[PDB]
Amino acid sequence: NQGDNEISVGNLRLNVTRRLVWLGETALDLTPKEYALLSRLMMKAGSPVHREILYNDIYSWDNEPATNTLEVHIHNLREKIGKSRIRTVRGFGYMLANNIDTE
Incomplete structure (x- = not known):
């Protein structure tokens, strides 16, 4: 917030x-x-x-x-974020791999 804020x-x-996100460098x-x-998904990376x-993030x-359109819009954005580096937990929420790759 002090003119700077970022997480990984x-x-x-x-x-x-800058409002930008990198993936695989x-x-x-x-x-x-x-x-x-997405900013909310990383805000709680681990659960x-x-x-x-x-949905409350924007409104x-x-x-x-x-x-049907709100859930489909997410399906359209789903392919953009690359479900590969993401992990969905049943039809209840989303969760990013908290560096589970490095054991």
Whole structure:
């Protein structure tokens, strides 16, 4: 917050100051919206993050989306973040590998 703020988890680096995220030392291209919900995923890297808090990241007014689209948008963004370096925990939340690769 002091004009600087960034965090990393394994081979993934995040920078809220510039609002950019790297993956495998390569700059990953994700829409700004994903950076908000994603910023929450890393905020709690080690446990399953509720899916409602992510939706609350950009807005928690919850209108009345009866048609499927909010969960599908995540499926579209899912391929952008590369599920490879991510780990989903059942249909309840998401969790990043807390450097589980290095034993």
